[PDB]
Amino acid sequence: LKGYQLKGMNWLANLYEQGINGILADEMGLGKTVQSIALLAHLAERENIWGPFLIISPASTLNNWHQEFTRFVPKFKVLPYWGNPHDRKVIRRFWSAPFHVVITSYQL
Amino acid sequence: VLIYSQMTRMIDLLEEYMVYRKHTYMRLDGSSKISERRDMVADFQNRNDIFVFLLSTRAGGLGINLTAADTVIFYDSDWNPTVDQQAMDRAHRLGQTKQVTVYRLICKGTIEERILQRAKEKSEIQRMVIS
Amino acid sequence: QLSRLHMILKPFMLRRIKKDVENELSDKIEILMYCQLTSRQKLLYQAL
Amino acid sequence: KIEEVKSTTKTQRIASHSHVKGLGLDESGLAKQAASGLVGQENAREACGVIVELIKSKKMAGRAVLLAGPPGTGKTALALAIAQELGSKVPFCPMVGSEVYSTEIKKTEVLMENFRRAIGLRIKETKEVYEGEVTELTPCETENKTISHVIIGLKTAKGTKQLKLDPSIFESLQKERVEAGDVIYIEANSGAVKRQGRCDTYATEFDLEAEEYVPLPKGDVHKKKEIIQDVTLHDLDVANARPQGGQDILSMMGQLMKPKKTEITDKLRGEINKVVNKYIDQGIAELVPGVLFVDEVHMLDIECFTYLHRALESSIAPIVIFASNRGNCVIRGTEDITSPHGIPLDLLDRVMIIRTMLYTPQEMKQIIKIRAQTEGINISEEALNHLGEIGTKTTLRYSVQLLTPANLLAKINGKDSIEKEHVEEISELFYDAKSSAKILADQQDKY
Numbered sequence: 188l189k190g191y192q193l194k195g196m197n198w199l200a201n202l203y204e205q206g207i208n209g210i211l212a213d214e215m216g217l218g219k220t221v222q223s224i225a226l227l228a229h230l231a232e233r234e235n236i237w238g239p240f241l242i243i244s245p246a247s248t249l250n251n252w253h254q255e256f257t258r259f260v261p262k263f264k265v266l267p268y269w270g271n272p273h274d275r276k277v278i279r280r281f282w283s284a285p286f287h288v289v290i291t292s293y294q295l
Numbered sequence: 296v297l298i299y300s301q302m303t304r305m306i307d308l309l310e311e312y313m314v315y316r317k318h319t320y321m322r323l324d325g326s327s328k329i330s331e332r333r334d335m336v337a338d339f340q341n342r343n344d345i346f347v348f349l350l351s352t353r354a355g356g357l358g359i360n361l362t363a364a365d366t367v368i369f370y371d372s373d374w375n376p377t378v379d380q381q382a383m384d385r386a387h388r389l390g391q392t393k394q395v396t397v398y399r400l401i402c403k404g405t406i407e408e409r410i411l412q413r414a415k416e417k418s419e420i421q422r423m424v425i426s
Numbered sequence: 427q428l429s430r431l432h433m434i435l436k437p438f439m440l441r442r443i444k445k446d447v448e449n450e451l452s453d454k455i456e457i458l459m460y461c462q463l464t465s466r467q468k469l470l471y472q473a474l
Numbered sequence: 475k476i477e478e479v480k481s482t483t484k485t486q487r488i489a490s491h492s493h494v495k496g497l498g499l500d501e502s503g504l505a506k507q508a509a510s511g512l513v514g515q516e517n518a519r520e521a522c523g524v525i526v527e528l529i530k531s532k533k534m535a536g537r538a539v540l541l542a543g544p545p546g547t548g549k550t551a552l553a554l555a556i557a558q559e560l561g562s563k564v565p566f567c568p569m570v571g572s573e574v575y576s577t578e579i580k581k582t583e584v585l586m587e588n589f590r591r592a593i594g595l596r597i598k599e600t601k602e603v604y605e606g607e608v609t610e611l612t613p614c615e616t617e618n619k620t621i622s623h624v625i626i627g628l629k630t631a632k633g634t635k636q637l638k639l640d641p642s643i644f645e646s647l648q649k650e651r652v653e654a655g656d657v658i659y660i661e662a663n664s665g666a667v668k669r670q671g672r673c674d675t676y677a678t679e680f681d682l683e684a685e686e687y688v689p690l691p692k693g694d695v696h697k698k699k700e701i702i703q704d705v706t707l708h709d710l711d712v713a714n715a716r717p718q719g720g721q722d723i724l725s726m727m728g729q730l731m732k733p734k735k736t737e738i739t740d741k742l743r744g745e746i747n748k749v750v751n752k753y754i755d756q757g758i759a760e761l762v763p764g765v766l767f768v769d770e771v772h773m774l775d776i777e778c779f780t781y782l783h784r785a786l787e788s789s790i791a792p793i794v795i796f797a798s799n800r801g802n803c804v805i806r807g808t809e810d811i812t813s814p815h816g817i818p819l820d821l822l823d824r825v826m827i828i829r830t831m832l833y834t835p836q837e838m839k840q841i842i843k844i845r846a847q848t849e850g851i852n853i854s855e856e857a858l859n860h861l862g863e864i865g866t867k868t869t870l871r872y873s874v875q876l877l878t879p880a881n882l883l884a885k886i887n888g889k890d891s892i893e894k895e896h897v898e899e900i901s902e903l904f905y906d907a908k909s910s911a912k913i914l915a916d917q918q919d920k921y
């Protein structure tokens with residue numbers, strides 16, 4: 188954790204409670220993965236402990252997302268969604284909730 | 296060191312070059328699989344065995360996060376900043392312990408100075424809408 | 427336009443710029459490194 | 475932010491004609507007063523303007539011109555201007571009259587080597603070739619046994635093929651010491667092997683080896699290509715007269731013995747003409763009949779001038795440019811026959827004479843300026859006016875030749891540019907042909 192990230196969460200929380208979306212637009216290398224993961228870590232009220240999310244991203248990033256979800260707080264049920272039609276079909280049938288995030292890319 | 300270029304044909308020329316001089320290269324490019332974008336990253340960090348990494352600014356310059364690079368060479372400049380800046384900051388990063396040198400390699404007068412003039416003009420006009 | 431675009435973004439964008447969190451890591455040195463064209467390049471550029 | 479800027483390579487060296495870039499004519503064929511590096515000589519340049527259209531027309535053979543005029547009048551400069559005006563694609567063959575005196579071959583044949591060398595030829599040669607890593611190599615014996623067939627496996631980034639070849643190719647591969655895992659090239663036209671190196675796939679196989687490891691070839695194992703060869707009829711004559719192509723022990727050793735010239739027989743030149751006429755009929759060739767330039771022509775021997783009567787009348791011959799700096803000399807080899815320009819009257823009919831003439835002081839100032847800014851130096855106007863004065867006192871070349879010594883003195887005593895005191899000093903350090911001929915005639919008792 189770092190203080191500027193936690194103050195980012197306290198800023199995002201009022202947007203979330205107002206039904207307002209926002210941009211984390213900080214200069215590169217400042218932990219937007221950590222901040223967007225921390226939506227789960229610093230709102231205790233169930234929606235952000237067992238609710239299903241989705242991440243859409245450039246294809247080179249998919250594994251650093253999947254890794255960083257394990258490094259900060261590994262408790263969340265994370266689904267990868269990349270590679271062959273058979274492999275993505277196997278995972279697609281899981282969401283037939285325990286799907287706390289899916290990690291994805293825009294072509295898919 | 297990281298090397299960025301636009302043309303896949305040029306990255307093939309640079310791979311021909313770093314086969315010839317024994318520079319222990321590795322590359323990421325539009326043709327490369329997610330299982331390569333896993334492993335080729337994970338082997339450039341966690342090791343000293345790979346002196347140079349070869350990249351596209353578009354396939355490589357987003358979220359790749361190569362903190363083990365010390366320096367960056369733009370063999371091409373793109374018509375737009377941000378793309379270069381994202382590519383630079385994927386060496387110049389939280390978790391480094393060093394300066395970063397970024398080199399732009401440019402032909403005098405022919406065409407690359409027109410790209411660079413637009414990059415300069417954009418890199419200032421892009422400020423006043425934010426700060 | 428500048429102040430309106432700022433005021434539209436201020437309620438729902440965060441943009442710190444590096445020195446406000448990278449407090450102790452220094453900026454990039456940028457080296458604009460010039461090259462001449464080689465003789466074969468000068469000829470092919472002239473042919474274009 | 476920061477910049478880096480480098481270029482360590484030295485320039486080309488400045489030569490006695492390298493300011494000449496073309497004849498400096500306008501589109502109507504009139505001379506500009508000074509352009510493309512030249513100054514003055516308007517009639518002699520407009521006459522060369524007719525000759526550069528003569529060359530580009532291709533129609534003629536053996537037409538010839540004599541640039542005639544005193545030393546320093548620019549004769550070789552106009553012939554160099556023609557060489558620039560034609561561009562690199564047409565052969566201009568520079569020659570000096572005293573080069574015919576070979577000790578390997580007759581004078582009356584050194585002229586034919588140059589005449590055949592000035593006729594250029596562009597050939598659309600189709601080469602068909604094999605290249606790859608040698609994955610397999612097997613020679614086959616057959617009954618009277620002897621080696622009679624060759625099986626070769628070749629591999630590239632585009633898969634692999636097995637090829638079947640003539641035993642002369644196996645003897646070539648054995649000569650090149652080709653073995654499995656080598657990367658090779660074979661043009662099937664010459665049957666010529668090149669061992670490119672050892673395949674880079676094997677570069678880790680030893681801690682220490684002599685080989686050049688090379689990356690695996692790209693595209694098909696077997697492929698055809700067109701090479702746009704530039705060649706001259708002399709290159710066809712001489713390559714057939716002492717053959718180094720093919721792969722037998724004889725061609726392999728005509729490549730070792732001393733490369734003596736030989737008096738090529740007219741039967742060979744005839745069979746070359748028949749062959750290249752067929753490459754022209756086939757559309758495989760374009761002929762580019764160029765220029766022979768004989769500087770100092772006035773000392774070809776009378777054997778040679780009398781050969782040139784026949785040579786300049788050939789339907790094959792190139793266009794020929796001669797230069798002479800001489801008056802009514804005795805012609806070499808005649809004992810005591812005198813004729814204009816040192817050339818027999820019998821040859822002197824066969825040439826269009828381009829008279830070239832002494833410069834005014836104003837043309838000398840203007841050449842010296844154009845020359846100084848080509849030698850890369852800055853010169854003050856009273857110093858250049860003093861060089862123009864020296865031009866009237868002496869000659870164009872001495873006046874030009876004081877420039878670089880003056881620039882040496884200028885930088886040595888710390889100036890940026892030539893001051894008149896530098897030229898005025900250099901004029902006393904170095905004598906000239908006219909002023910030396912005073913002290914050397916005055917002190918004549920002592921030499």
Ligand SMILES: Nc1ncnc2c1ncn2[C@@H]1O[C@H](COP(=O)(O)OP(=O)(O)O)[C@@H](O)[C@H]1O
Nearest residue numbers: 188189214215216217218219220221360389390
């Ligand atoms: N507390 C932390 N401890 C270690 N690394 C951190 C920490 N907070 C952030 N990071 C670093 O943040 C980086 C991720 O930044 P990222 O989200 O990719 O930024 P951006 O998208 O702006 O370029 C990772 O390299 C990670 O190690």
Ligand SMILES: Nc1ncnc2c1ncn2[C@@H]1O[C@H](COP(=O)(O)OP(=O)(O)O)[C@@H](O)[C@H]1O
Nearest residue numbers: 490491511512513515545546547548549550551
């Ligand atoms: N018309 C000219 N324009 C420019 N430079 C000339 C001209 N005529 C002569 N020169 C230069 O002056 C020198 C003498 O000319 P050159 O051709 O060498 O004379 P020559 O007929 O005796 O061989 C050379 O450096 C030459 O390039």
